[PDB]
Amino acid sequence: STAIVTNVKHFGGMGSALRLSEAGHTVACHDESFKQKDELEAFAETYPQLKPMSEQEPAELIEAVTSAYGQVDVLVSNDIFAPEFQPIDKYAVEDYRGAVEALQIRPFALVNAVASQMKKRKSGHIIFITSATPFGPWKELSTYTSARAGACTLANALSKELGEYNIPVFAIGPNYLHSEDSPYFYPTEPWKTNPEHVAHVKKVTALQRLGTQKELGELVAFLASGSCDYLTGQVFWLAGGFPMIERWPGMP
Amino acid sequence: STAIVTNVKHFGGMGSALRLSEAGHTVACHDESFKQKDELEAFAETYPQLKPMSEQEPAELIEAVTSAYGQVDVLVSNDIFAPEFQPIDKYAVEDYRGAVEALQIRPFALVNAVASQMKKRKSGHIIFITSATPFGPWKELSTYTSARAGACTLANALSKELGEYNIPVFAIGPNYLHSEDSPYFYPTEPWKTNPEHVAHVKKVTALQRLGTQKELGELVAFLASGSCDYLTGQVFWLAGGFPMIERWPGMP
Amino acid sequence: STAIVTNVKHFGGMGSALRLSEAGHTVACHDESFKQKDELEAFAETYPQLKPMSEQEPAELIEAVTSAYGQVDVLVSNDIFAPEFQPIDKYAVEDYRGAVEALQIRPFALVNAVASQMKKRKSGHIIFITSATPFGPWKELSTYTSARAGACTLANALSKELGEYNIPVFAIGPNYLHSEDSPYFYPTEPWKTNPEHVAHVKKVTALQRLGTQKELGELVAFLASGSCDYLTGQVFWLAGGFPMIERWPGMP
Amino acid sequence: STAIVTNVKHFGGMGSALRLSEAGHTVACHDESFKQKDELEAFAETYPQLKPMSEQEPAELIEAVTSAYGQVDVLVSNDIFAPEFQPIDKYAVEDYRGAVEALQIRPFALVNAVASQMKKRKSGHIIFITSATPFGPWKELSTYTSARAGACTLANALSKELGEYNIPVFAIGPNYLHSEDSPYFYPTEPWKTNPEHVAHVKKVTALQRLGTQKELGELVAFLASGSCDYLTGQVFWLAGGFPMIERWPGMP
Ligand SMILES: [N-]=[N+]=NC[C@H](O)c1ccc([N+](=O)[O-])cc1
Ligand SMILES: [N-]=[N+]=NC[C@H](O)c1ccc([N+](=O)[O-])cc1
Ligand SMILES: [N-]=[N+]=NC[C@H](O)c1ccc([N+](=O)[O-])cc1
Ligand SMILES: [N-]=[N+]=NC[C@H](O)c1ccc([N+](=O)[O-])cc1
């Protein structure tokens, strides 16, 4: 079928697009950099099994993919934001508005733009790549964490109405997911190269390692395949057993 | 001490302000109508124990209450929004922005404005009145429901950073909470007077009745009293046992 | 690899064994009926790809499969119980003991018996088929629902310690999952044949249909394939969007 | 009214019993040690405001309290168990049976014995003192943790059926709750006196301190007063913001 993966160069983007592509789907890919022809052309040459698009806005993008390939069967809203850790009083309200715009308004805008066509033919799959931080919040990241929570619930809520139209909706919330060259959350440097970071991951996750782009891709492809639509409304915690809670003194 | 209750005329506003005042607290009250001298004076006459403020914006309000009464010890962010039920594709993206602005950005801005004074003296209580809807989403209310979830997580996340400063943070999520004359969610008319509505409440809640402002007020006053700070981070489900789940055919 | 699926004739048993066998695994199956020679042989003739075992107890079952096929790589504890709907005071305390023994003690015993061999070679997958009822309890099913909750948490807790040994642990909680000829919860008759039952399912689930054994098996096979171990600790709500909550009067 | 607090010398026992008595309630207390006249009379002399009972079994206790003090209006099931920490394969299945018997079967049996009388009057309150561990499992404590989860769900489930009879049901899940002289979970020695332990608590809790019996007592009395029945079904996380999650390397 035809799928859309946003911010393809970051977070869960490459893992999702590459695996969906290998499953035989036509993967239209969005990314802020594709605004420039040079950047879109470079990506296209590197990944001929992918279809990079230049469109940036929700409605614009859904329409271009629909016109180019016929329709949008799968939506993978891989949302990202660059937050700063900050005490609640040191943030600017604008800082929270920005987090909400990127992690809640954006996914909502994409579904708002594609829902009608999916509902008319009674088929489609919606997947939000959110975060697991709501399940185990760190101190001083209130804007990002709360925003991601809104996104998770958005997915769960949407599943309730779209189910009638045979449209499953899921939210995959990762943490400690290797992002390779992307700074979006866990790049190879320093997460696989620095001793302190390696030891941190080994302590905080049950599997004692970062999650792989492949694991994420497999999950995305599995859900988009229509192999298990009954999981609609599910919020997945792709966090490898995180969080590992500090035990009493004397316990290793 | 000194407390602030926003949108006092609606939702959990009156129950909160009334019980807090009966507790002996100085209660400064905010409300959109207080922009009108007439409305402010009339309120002050009916509830002489309460101190209505004309200030509307977060920073403005915290400053006004601080100058007038010395400091803000308790913040009750009683947030409201009037959403429409709509299939995802029928909403305007602006409809989600409005919901998020009123239910997430506002409480965030109020804490952002008062946190520094609380942290300096290492004392204060923060209470968000959110919603139990995220716990049991209805079909077609994705904007309001997801926004409320962000607010619940905001509170929990904040409890993590403010705990070091001895500042408890709670979120009270009601549903089917009687609002008396306020149209915000459950006014006396028609919820206590129309058969179909009375019957609906009886079916969906375990206690088979609306919750009372008195009950909400007792909880707010209890948490603000400093009698049980150890519940910091709690999301309270003030919904009378909702949701009651439809059982199999033939079962009573 | 070698998998074990318990109570194979009921609940999530057939979907799990069938799809696991299709994935190329050797599937040893347990069932109370296999105690009888006639039953075991009739099953082996009908499903020649499956390996019915006569063993009934945890330790002997794990030992027999290990001796016959070498080792137990995957454990699918498909637990069942036949509860009665009763007001708390009409139950016998023994009724709860029986529910806990069947839904909590059994899976714990199976893991207790196989854990050491999986830990030694640092490989294996543990999957509990539990229930979604804890997520949305009905009245008068306190014994079954609470017990199932104990099982979900058991899986999650186990993921924390077994992760260090590369052993993912999952809990699949279904509801409204078609069980075909098995009375364990949703047999074809009357769930797909009687108007009121069909209409009931269309009302309380988002997808407005029963889940299929195929969907359950696909999930079980996906998880056992080692394609997404990073989901360890996950409790899956295989309930098609259930529960759908009754909305305000006037809303369809 | 008349309240029953079990295992009064341990866990949330004294805090609950003492505050309930200060509130004016007649508080019948149960404890395994009260089987000895010596221990019972000694307790009675020290706390003339409490009424220790010798009865050990549920049915016997409810009848004894009903006969001596008219009826049972409030049940505080303060359940305890002394678990060992161990990898799943090192436990004895009997170890899990003991945990479930003490933490799940016991509270169930007590409600099973007093429910009929409360339903008849259509009044009463049920409070289970469980645990917050299910919310943040430590590895190697799978028996205790999962059993506690079962008890939490048992409460929420019962609220669904008992609400129709105006009987609120709650579950208070503590962690890091100071237990003073009782070894049940957090005694003064060493939690308030040994550096390594004091520091551990400082690290894992948001408020950076142990919870006080007074706090637990206030919550119990508040809920038992009928001041806020609309919270029925609630699972309270009385853990001071626990768990605090370890942050990235370099972060303070
Ligand atoms: N996979 N993964 N990681 C995503 C996670 O939501 C996240 C964790 C930390 C931060 N951060 O900024 O510290 C951002 C996102
Ligand atoms: N108590 N109470 N009500 C608050 C709840 O969040 C809510 C429920 C329904 C609606 N609504 O618009 O139908 C709005 C808010
Ligand atoms: N699939 N599926 N359903 C299993 C579910 O746990 C269940 C639902 C109802 C009952 N029951 O007895 O009514 C038992 C189990
Ligand atoms: N308050 N409090 N503690 C109760 C909690 O469930 C618990 C935590 C740890 C242990 N333990 O044995 O380590 C037992 C119980």
Contact C105, D97 (CB under 8 A): yes
| DSSP, residue by residue, C129-191 | E--SGGGSPPTT-HHHHHHHHHHHHHHHHHHHHHGGGT--EEEEEESSB--BT--SS-BHHHH
- Cα–ligand 1 centroid distance for A78 (angstroms): 13
What's the longest Cα–Cα distance across chain B?
A: 64
Residue C227: count other Cβ atoms within 10 Å of its Cβ: 18
Q: For chain C, how big is the Rg over CA atoms in Å?
A: 18
Beginning with the edge strand found earlier in the chain, give each strand of the sheet holding C2-5 in spatial order: C50-52, C26-29, C2-5, C74-78, C125-129, C169-174, C235-238
Rounded Cα–Cα distance for residues A56 and A38 (Å): 16
For residue A44, count CB atoms less than 10 angstroms from its CB and return exposed for 0-12, middle for 13-18, buried for 19 or more. middle
d(CA C77, CA C129): 6
Tell me the C-alpha distance between B187 and B190, whole Å.
Answer: 7
CB of D33 closer than 8 Å to CB of D56: no
Q: Which of D167, D164, D151, D169 is nearest to D117 (CA)?
A: D167
Residue D14 · residue D3 · CB < 8 Å: no
Distance C236 CA to ligand 3 centre (A): 15
The amino acid present at C180, given as its one-letter code, is E
Rounded distance between C-alpha atoms, residue C136 and residue C139, angstroms: 10
- The alpha-helical segments, DSSP class H, found in chain D are 13-22, 37-46, 58-69, 93-100, 106-121, 142-162, 188-191, 195-204, 213-224
The CATH code of domain A1-252 reads 3.40.50.720
Question: How many other C-beta atoms are found inside a 10 Å radius of the C-beta of residue B174?
Answer: 28
Measured distance between the N- and C-terminal CA atoms of chain D, rounded to whole angstroms: 50
Phi, psi of B170 (to 5 degrees): -130, 165
Strand partners, D235: D171
DSSP 8-state symbol, C7: S
Among B197, B243, B249, beta carbon nearest to C243: B243
Burial B179-208 (b: 16+ CB within 10 A, else e): bbebebbbbeeebeeeeebbebbeebbbbb
| Residues composing chain C | 252
- Resolution of the model in angstroms: 1.9
Q: How far, in Å, CA of B79 to CA of B128, rounded? A: 8
Consecutive H or E run containing A172: strand A169-174
Neighbours of B62 (CB within 10 A): 25
Give dist(CA A102, CA A115) in Å, integer.
19
Q: Is D77 helix (H, G, I), strand (E, B) or coil?
A: strand
Residue D104: Cβ within 10 Å count: 32
Please name which of C155, C163, C152, C169 lies closest in space to residue C237, comparing C-alpha atoms: C152
Q: Are B28 and B228 in contact (CB under 8 A)?
A: no
The HSE-up count of residue B56 (CA atoms within 13 Å, CB side) is 7
* Residue ID of nearest Cα to ligand 3 atom 5: C175
Query: Which residues on adjacent β-strands are paired with residue B238?
Result: B174
Q: Which residues fall within 8 angstroms of residue B32, CB to CB, at 6 or more apart?
A: B7, B56
CA D168 to chain centre: 16
Cα B248 from Cα C204, distance rounded (Å): 10
Residue D174, helix vs strand vs coil = strand
Q: Tokens 């079967």 sit at which residue?
A: D105
Residue with tokens 């969907």: C215
Answer whether D39's CB lies under 8 Å from D112's CB.
Answer: no
Q: What is the rounded CA–CA span in Å between residue C64 and residue A198?
A: 41
> Is ligand 2 within 6 A of the CB of residue B145?
no
Contact D161 C87 (CB under 8 A): yes
Contact present, A75 and A20 (Cβ < 8 Å)? no
| Structure tokens belonging to residue D204 | 């894992």
Q: Closest partner residue to B215 among D208, D218, D230, by Cβ?
A: D230
Q: Is residue D53 a contact partner of residue D61, using CB atoms and an 8 Å limit?
A: yes
Q: Where are the domains of chain C?
A: 1-252
Cα of first residue to Cα of last residue in chain A, in angstroms, is 50
- Closest atom of ligand 3 to C83 CA is 12
- For residue A252 the two structure tokens come to 């290793």
Integer distance in angstroms from the first to the last C-alpha of chain B? 50
| D92 CB burial (10 A radius; 0-12, 13-18, 19+) | exposed
> Are residues D236 and B230 in contact, defined by beta-carbon separation less than 8 angstroms?
no
Query: What is residue A156's three-state secondary structure?
Result: helix
Q: How far apart are CA D252 and CA D241, in angstroms?
A: 18
- What does DSSP assign to residue A105? I
| Alpha carbon of B54 to ligand 2 centroid (Å) | 26
Q: Do A138 and D200 touch (CB under 8 A)?
A: no
Structure tokens at A153: 């619930």
Q: Report d(CA D87, CA D95) in Å as an integer.
A: 12
Question: Which residue in chain D is spatially nearest to C113 when comparing CA positions?
Answer: D89
Chain B: touching chains (3 or more CB pairs < 8 Å): A, C, D
Classify the phi-psi angles of C183: left when phi > 0, otherwise alpha if psi is within -120 to 50, otherwise beta: alpha
Tokens standing for residue C143: 């014994």
Residue C16, token pair as written in the block: 């799990």
**Residue A10 C-alpha, separation from nearest chain D C-alpha, in angstroms:** 20
Helices B13-22 and B213-224 pack at an angle, to 10 degrees, of 50
Token digits for D237?
Answer: 């996380």
Mention every residue, 6+ apart, whose C-beta is less than 8 A from residue A195.
Answer: none
Ligand 4, atom 9: closest residue by C-alpha? D185
Rounded Cα–Cα distance for residues D83 and B80 (Å): 47
Q: Does D238 touch chain C (CB under 8 A)?
A: no
**What gap in Å lies between CA B15 and CA B9, rounded to an integer?**
10
Method by which the model was determined = X-ray
Name the closest-CA residue to atom 13, ligand 1. A185
C191-198 long-range Cβ contacts below 8 angstroms, 24+ apart: C194/B249, C196/B249, C196/B250, C197/B248, C197/B249
User: To the nearest whole angstrom, how far is the Cα of A35 from the nearest Cα of chain D?
Assistant: 33
Residue C88 burial (CB < 10 Å; 0-12/13-18/19+)?
Answer: buried
- Among residues B110, B129, B116, the alpha carbon closest in space to that of B17 is found at B129
Q: Whose CA is nearest to atom 4 of ligand 4?
A: D175
Q: Distances in Å between the alpha carbon of D21 and those of D70, D213, D226?
A: 17, 14, 15
Ligand 4 contact, D133 CB (< 6 A): yes
Give the separation between CA A82 and CA A77, rounded to whole angstroms: 16
Q: Residues of A numbered 24-83 whose beta carbons fall under 8 angstroms of chain D's beta carbons: which are they?
A: none
| Interchain CB contact of C187 with B (< 8 Å) | no
For every residue of chain B, DSSP letters joined together read -EEEETTTTSTTHHHHHHHHHHTT-EEEE--GGGGSHHHHHHHHHH-TTSEE----SHHHHHHHHHHHHS---EEEEE---------GGGS-HHHHHHHHIIIIIHHHHHHHHHHHHHHHHT--EEEEE--SGGGSPPTT-HHHHHHHHHHHHHHHHHHHHHGGGT--EEEEEESSB--BT--SS-BHHHHTT-HHHHHHHHHHSSSSS-B-HHHHHHHHHHHHTTS-GGGTT-EEEESTTPPPPP--TT--
Distance from CA of A171 to the nearest CA of B (A): 13
- What are the start-end ranges of the E strands in chain C? 2-5, 26-29, 50-52, 74-78, 125-129, 169-174, 235-238
Cα-only R_g, chain D: 18
- Cα C177 to Cα A145, A232, C12, C50, C220: the distances in Å are 34, 14, 8, 22, 14
**B116: Cα separation from own chain's centroid:** 22
Contact A227, A221 (CB under 8 A): no
Nearest chain D residue (CA) to B123: D207
DSSP letter string, A23-72: TT-EEEE--GGGGSHHHHHHHHHH-TTSEE----SHHHHHHHHHHHHS--
Query: Does D102 touch chain C if contact means CB atoms closer than 8 Å?
Result: no
Residue B79 · residue B130 · CB < 8 Å: yes
H or E segment to which residue C217 belongs: helix C213-224
- Give the three-class secondary structure for A240: coil
Smallest Cβ distance to C163: which of A163, A208, A212?
A208
Distance CA A61, CA A82 (A): 23
Residue numbers in A near C207 (CB within 8 A): 163, 166, 168, 229-230, 232
Scan for tokens 């454990």, then name that residue. C75
DSSP bridge pairs for B77 = B128
Report which ligand 1 atom has the smallest distance to the Cα of D248: 13
> Taking a C-beta distance cutoff of 8 angstroms, is the pair C134, D153 a contact?
yes
Which of the 8 DSSP states describes residue C110?
H
| Residue B186 near ligand 2, beta carbon < 6 Å | yes
Going by C-beta distance under 8 Å and a sequence separation of 6 or more, which residues neighbour residue D119? Answer: C87, C89, D162, D165, D167
DSSP letter for each residue of D54-75? ---SHHHHHHHHHHHHS---EE
Q: Any residues with Cβ below 6 Å from ligand 3, and which?
A: C 83, 131, 133, 144, 174-175, 177, 185-186
DSSP calls for D208-221 = SSPBPHHHHHHHHH
How far is it, in rounded angstroms, from Cα D129 to Cα B48?
Answer: 42
The ligand 1 atom nearest the CA atom of A239: 1
- Residues within 6 Å of ligand 1 by CB: A 83, 131, 133, 141, 144, 174-177, 185-186
